[PDB]
Structures are given as C-alpha cells and as structure tokens.
Ligand binder design. Sequence first.
Ligand SMILES: CC(=O)N[C@@H]1[C@@H](O)[C@H](O[C@@H]2O[C@H](CO)[C@@H](O)[C@H](O)[C@H]2NC(C)=O)[C@@H](CO)O[C@H]1O
Ligand SMILES: CC(=O)N[C@@H]1[C@@H](O)[C@H](O[C@@H]2O[C@H](CO)[C@@H](O)[C@H](O)[C@H]2NC(C)=O)[C@@H](CO)O[C@H]1O
Length: 369
Amino acid sequence: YNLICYFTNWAQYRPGLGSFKPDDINPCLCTHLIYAFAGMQNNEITTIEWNDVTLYKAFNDLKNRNSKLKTLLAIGGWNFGTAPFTTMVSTSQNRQTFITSVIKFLRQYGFDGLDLDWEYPGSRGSPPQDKHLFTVLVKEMREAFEQEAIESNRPRLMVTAAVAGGISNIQAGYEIPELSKYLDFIHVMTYDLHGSWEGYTGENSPLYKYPTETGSNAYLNVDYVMNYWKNNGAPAEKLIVGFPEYGHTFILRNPSDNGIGAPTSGDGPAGPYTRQAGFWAYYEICTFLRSGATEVWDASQEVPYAYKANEWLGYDNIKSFSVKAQWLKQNNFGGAMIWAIDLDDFTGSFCDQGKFPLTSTLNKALGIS
Ligand SMILES: CC(=O)N[C@@H]1[C@@H](O)[C@H](O[C@@H]2O[C@H](CO)[C@@H](O)[C@H](O)[C@H]2NC(C)=O)[C@@H](CO)O[C@H]1O
Ligand SMILES: CC(=O)N[C@@H]1[C@@H](O)[C@H](O[C@@H]2O[C@H](CO)[C@@H](O)[C@H](O)[C@H]2NC(C)=O)[C@@H](CO)O[C@H]1O
C-alpha cells in the first residue's frame, strides 16, 4: 500500500508551535510526500513562496533518510481557481509550454513527479470542453514523461492527480476510463463532504451514509465516492483514499439540537493556529476535546463528532482512521493520502497520543514500516 502525505508551504507562517517546515517531517512515515503548491505564470510552472527553493531542498533531502521515499510537486489547489488551467490546456502550444516547464522544474529541484490539482475541469468557471482537454493534458504529459525518461536515461517522472469527491464535479470534469489509463495514481478528495456551507451539521469524511440519507445526500460518503470512481473506469489499485487530518466546525443555532443534521448558522469558529473560519487542525481539535467537549461516535458512519455549548465539530480520530484503513485495504485500493501532515499533532504536545498520531495510525495499518 502507499501512504501519500501532503505538505503545505504556508504552514510555516502559523504562530508558535503551529509553524511547520519539511524538516519537521518524519521521513519514514509515508511512501510519498507531495509539496502543496506550485503555481503557474505564462503557462509555466513556478514557485509561489519566497523560500520555496529552500523548502524544496529540505523536502527532497528527506530522501537522505529513506531510500524508498518519493516526492511529488502539486500544482494548483482550491484557491488557484481554474482560469490559468483553462488557458493552458486550450491550445497544444500552451500545453507544450507547460509540460516542458514541468519537466525542467521537477528535474532541477529533485521531484519524482507532478500532482495535478485542478479543482476542477468543467466547474468553478471552467467551460465544458475542459473535461476532454484535461484528458488530453494528462495523456500528453504522460507521453512526454515517458519520452524524457528515454532521453535522460532516468526512471520516468510520475503523473498523478487530486480529483473531486463531489459527484456533480466528477461528472462534469473527468473522462474516467481514458484518464485512468494515463495517471499513475488518482488521489480522491474524500473529505469536505459536509460543512457549514450546508446550514446544518455533518461529518467531514464519513465512511458510510447516514441511515436517513437518500438520493444526492447519499453520495456524501467515502464508500460511495470511491466506488463511483472504481465502477466508472478507474482500477482500484490506482485509487487512493483521501484522509483529512482536520475537522469542520459549526455554530449550532440551539445547543440542545446537537446531533447529525442539527441546524447551524454562519461559517463556524476559527482556531488560534490555522486562523480560518470553519476548520481546525487535529492538534487544535485535541485542545477542544481536552477542555470538556462532549464526544459522540457516529456509529453508522464510523467517525466521531463533538460539541461544547454551541460549537460542533465533525472530524476524524485514531479510531476512524483505523476503520477506514481496514475498509480501503479490504476493498483493494492502492492506499491512502492525507491532507495534510502539518495538521497532525506533529510535536506530540497537544493530544498526548505521541508524535504524528493520525499519520502513524495509517503507517501501521497500511504496513508502511
Ligand atoms: C489535495 C487537496 O486536498 N487539495 C485542496 C486543498 O487546497 C484544500 O486545502 C486548502 O488549500 C488552500 C489552497 O488551495 C488553503 O488556502 C486552505 O487554507 C486549505 N484549507 C484546509 C482546510 O486545509 C483541501 C482541504 O479542504 O482539499 C482540497 O480542496
Ligand atoms: C462533496 C462536495 O463537493 N463538497 C464541496 C466541498 O468540497 C467544498 O469545499 C472545498 O472542497 C475541496 C475538495 O474538493 C477542497 O479542496 C477545498 O479546500 C474546499 N473549500 C472549502 C471552503 O472548504 C465546498 C465549498 O463551498 O462546497 C461543497 O459542495
């Protein structure tokens, strides 16, 4: 099995003990590390942080303590939008400019491949032709990587993609049979499945549907999403299940209504380290739980939730990671990916569960070490 771990190049700016850089990564935890994110300028890949070149070196130097470890550079992300991708794939010339820039960039800085994180072809302003043009991009990149391996006498660069977990986005975005032939791995973002945007409480990454969910609400679980990909053309061995090391926060409209589906208001509270309404890192979750929040096991969906006063949290812990790891193994998937290792209790000083408690759980369950 593979354990793919995202690292974010803005975690360095979090206050105090939230600050995280590649040197804080245990090189033996994962099989693949992915660097989030590169950007794009004039159809070429580029850095986006003043010290990215330094962090690239620190990141790829982790291979000095794990000869099995591979690294990839992710381009895009949620906040990158779509317009630069739409422009880049719109002509063969623009695609060639990009692919050529990617090869030189990855080889120069020590990366083993590229993780395409366009969120998403055919949605969020991207026109309908981008569904097929995304396939064209991936095919041409896969072929260019094969030819560069021949030309440089090195092992081929990998091409992977982070892909939507929402069904309407999947349907608008991906030619799954053809795409799955050319990608090395498919990183399915089976999280952010519920959140304050819905107006009621729900779980970030439930394994199964809630018992009363029907129709499109019954798409919002890991089991449905992964099997959608598998049964619409993707081989299970290439499919990687997404695991969030964060949870989503909600404000209850009435603290006595605190179950799944309870009405909520606003965007949800921010944590002192991540400082973003609506989500908390796992180490921030631990401070909430230790302070006396009521903890509930959502038995039907195999995930925890917790609340205190009018604050409600849908999240994942050691037990839910363990359940979903056993599930993915018994369903013959290729492994797990985590968003993101800097959200684990990497110092071990927030949760009293040791260093990297969530990431270590998957390392053990997937036989990585
Ligand atoms: C592989 C993947 O999950 N990609 C997306 C991530 O971008 C997203 O995380 C968010 O990334 C933004 C930049 O694109 C950051 O500004 C933002 O703080 C961050 N949000 C969180 C909760 O980490 C994750 C998680 O939602 O999933 C995809 O959407
Ligand atoms: C099932 C589904 O499609 N849910 C949507 C959420 O994904 C989405 O949030 C975004 O999810 C991305 C994963 O594909 C993350 O990369 C991204 O960071 C995240 N954005 C936020 C603000 O959390 C929300 C956006 O409103 O809508 C849901 O429909």
